[PDB]
Design an enzyme around this catalytic site. Structure first.
Site, mmCIF file in Angstrom:
data_model
loop_
_atom_site.group_PDB
_atom_site.id
_atom_site.type_symbol
_atom_site.label_atom_id
_atom_site.label_comp_id
_atom_site.label_asym_id
_atom_site.label_seq_id
_atom_site.Cartn_x
_atom_site.Cartn_y
_atom_site.Cartn_z
ATOM 1 N N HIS B 41 -8.225 8.909 -24.957
ATOM 2 C CA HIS B 41 -8.922 10.038 -24.283
ATOM 3 C C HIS B 41 -10.438 9.969 -24.545
ATOM 4 C CE1 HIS B 41 -7.913 12.970 -27.832
ATOM 5 N NE2 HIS B 41 -9.217 12.690 -27.884
ATOM 6 N N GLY B 143 -14.493 16.496 -32.123
ATOM 7 C CA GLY B 143 -15.097 15.335 -32.799
ATOM 8 C C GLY B 143 -14.184 14.725 -33.860
ATOM 9 N N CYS B 145 -10.972 13.863 -33.558
ATOM 10 C CA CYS B 145 -9.956 12.959 -32.986
ATOM 11 C C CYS B 145 -10.277 11.529 -33.431
ATOM 12 C CB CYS B 145 -9.865 13.091 -31.473
ATOM 13 S SG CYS B 145 -8.847 14.506 -30.975
HETATM 14 C C1 LIG Z 1 -9.952 15.925 -31.216
HETATM 15 C C2 LIG Z 1 -11.256 15.680 -30.507
HETATM 16 O O1 LIG Z 1 -12.242 15.340 -31.151
HETATM 17 N N1 LIG Z 1 -11.275 15.817 -29.162
HETATM 18 C C3 LIG Z 1 -10.131 16.215 -28.334
HETATM 19 C C4 LIG Z 1 -10.480 17.363 -27.420
HETATM 20 N N2 LIG Z 1 -11.681 17.002 -26.651
HETATM 21 S S1 LIG Z 1 -11.988 17.781 -25.243
HETATM 22 O O2 LIG Z 1 -10.732 18.054 -24.618
HETATM 23 O O3 LIG Z 1 -12.877 18.859 -25.549
HETATM 24 C C5 LIG Z 1 -12.859 16.617 -24.237
HETATM 25 C C6 LIG Z 1 -14.139 16.930 -23.801
HETATM 26 C C7 LIG Z 1 -14.862 16.042 -23.017
HETATM 27 C C8 LIG Z 1 -16.249 16.391 -22.538
HETATM 28 C C9 LIG Z 1 -14.279 14.830 -22.692
HETATM 29 C C10 LIG Z 1 -13.007 14.505 -23.130
HETATM 30 C C11 LIG Z 1 -12.269 15.388 -23.915
HETATM 31 C C12 LIG Z 1 -10.895 14.968 -24.360
HETATM 32 C C13 LIG Z 1 -12.827 16.734 -27.532
HETATM 33 C C14 LIG Z 1 -12.483 15.543 -28.382
#
Ligand SMILES: *CC(=O)N1CCN(S(=O)(=O)c2cc(C)ccc2C)CC1
Ligand SMILES: *CC(=O)N1CCN(S(=O)(=O)c2cc(C)ccc2C)CC1
EC number: 3.4.19.12
Lengths: 304, 304
Positions: B41, B143, B145
């Site tokens: 992702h 952040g 993930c």
């Molecule tokens: C766990 C982590 O750091 N993340 C997962 C959730 N996303 S998100 O869904 O906010 C997202 C935002 C953007 C702009 C692009 C892609 C994703 C998955 C943040 C990262």
């Protein structure tokens, strides 16, 4: 989201742990630059520990009696001295993994991470607080002494604790890295009882803020209180008196949640008076007091 | 003495954390040999996350679009591939700090340490369990993930978890290091509800053994029970059915304490039926289920 009892990453401290042996006793040392810090009771026989005269015991010890081992390499001891209740063993090699570091004497209510070690080898890491009675509630077996407690500010390790003692009640006593005990404790096998384990009020309030931030809100009520009224309830339940300094420290969590510190005090007041009624807050059935306001902001904002 | 929720020393894993950026999205990667593992992702815009076609999104990405940074040094990406829900970024440099490691898919009830990271920088370490509903109860912000979960056997890091997802109930879902989700979870922003969070019975019993070992014994009673009788009570309280395999696993703690597993089951039965009556066990007011029998033996014996 989610709120967990979190330790600092232990890597910088792992790189400082050695084994110290004097005769038959093995415990942990902290290797920073060309000095290894360890509890002075490494020079004792269990016999000695009833009433040790450390100056007199130390006279029988030479540099070559202190066996210092970093992994599977021996360090050469070129000097030794006693500072309060720790030994400083001067070695001929600066620890190449010495991080940026400070020694700090922490106040009761302040939290830190412990790297539990045995024979200079790390077993695990957990979060502690210096209790108001100057004990810590640790996990320390025989061989764990010389294990250290620390905070990390970006890249600087502030060492605040070295493990020395278990009280017959299974709580823990130790020193700062200048070898001064927290509280009235001594490195002697004697009658030493912990005083009242008082709850760190400012930490409980911080943790109630953490709960609201992470969605646990059932304990918010329609009440407020005053410092003096709250403190009547704190007294009854063996909580630390809440001061304007504590109110000031909770300011940022107040600001972010929009919950006035004294309203949260009124929630804590009702929880003290009525209990949890079988409910939980951030996965706990009691009021957690080993997160500082700083700890909550740090975890809730993702500082590294 | 003393019993604490303990994480593994994080040093070996700290040395594997990098930052991965694809476009505007920054998360953590795991750098082992010449491969960086990260959630797929990382290639998504938040828009994409409603119904992403990862194969199609990936077609638009070249090696040079994956910005990989270890501290303040850039890694050159010479290949990329998708394995299930993770990306494997081949870099031109073997991580010099690669520990001995394995990838293991853990069973529900098994515990592990999480190194929470942001921008490839470690913020902290805590102990988790894979829940019976294949969620974990973590502390993960935007952040985080690519943060990983692991066990250490002496010198070998077994990576078992990579963080991918938060459910609207604030629990956490992720993959093994082959990119397969634990449970039925998907890397899509959709309706995914956790099933019943069942209590890990064998872990509670282990922790009751830990308590007896560390002096907390008020909950021992004069009763015994059978697996089938205990399981009637387990059912009512949403506890995992206790099996002879679980009884066998508790054998060593049985042996050391001299408390028959089924007698401890009868203590747990009474605690389930009557509650703690405002008392605590190893500093907890509820029944702790994120220590394995292995975790109790390890901590109680001081393994490194
Ligand atoms: C766990 C982590 O750091 N993340 C997962 C959730 N996303 S998100 O869904 O906010 C997202 C935002 C953007 C702009 C692009 C892609 C994703 C998955 C943040 C990262
Ligand atoms: C914390 C730790 O590792 N130790 C402190 C307690 N001692 S001891 O009192 O058992 C002891 C035994 C012997 C044989 C010599 C000296 C001492 C202090 C173990 C170490």
């Amino acid at each position: 989201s989610g709120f967990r009892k979190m330790a600092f990453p232990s890597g910088k401290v792992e790189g400082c742990m050695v084994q110290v042996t004097c005769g038959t006793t093995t415990l942990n040392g902290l290797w920073l630059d060309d000095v290894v810090y360890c509890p002075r009771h490494v020079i004792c026989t269990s016999e000695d520990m009833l009433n040790p005269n450390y100056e007199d015991l130390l006279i029988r010890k030479s540099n070559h009696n202190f066996l210092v081992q970093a992994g599977n390499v021996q360090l050469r001891v070129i000097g030794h001295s006693m500072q309060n209740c720790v030994l400083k063993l001067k070695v001929d090699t600066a620890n190449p993994k010495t991080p940026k570091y400070k020694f700090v004497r922490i106040q009761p209510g302040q939290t830190f991470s412990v790297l539990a070690c045995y024979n200079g080898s790390p077993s695990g890491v957990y979060q502690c607080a210096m209790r108001p009675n100057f004990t810590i509630k640790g996990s320390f077996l025989n061989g764990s002494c010389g294990s250290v407690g620390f905070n990390i500010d970006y890249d600087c390790v502030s060492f605040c604790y070295m493990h020395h003692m278990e009280l017959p009640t299974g709580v823990h006593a130790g020193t700062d890295l200048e070898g001064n005990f927290y509280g009235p404790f001594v490195d002697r096998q004697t009658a030493q009882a912990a005083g009242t384990d008082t709850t760190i009020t400012v930490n409980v309030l911080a943790w109630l803020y953490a709960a609201v931030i992470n969605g646990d809100r059932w304990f918010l009520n329609r009440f407020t209180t005053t410092l003096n009224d709250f403190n009547l309830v704190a007294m009854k339940y063996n909580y630390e008196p809440l001061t304007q300094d504590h109110v000031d420290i909770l300011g940022p969590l107040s600001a972010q949640t929009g919950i006035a510190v004294l309203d949260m005090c009124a929630s804590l007041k009702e929880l003290l008076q009525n209990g949890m009624n079988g409910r939980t807050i951030l996965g706990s059935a009691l009021l957690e007091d080993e997160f500082t306001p700083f700890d909550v902001v740090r975890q809730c904002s993702g500082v590294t």
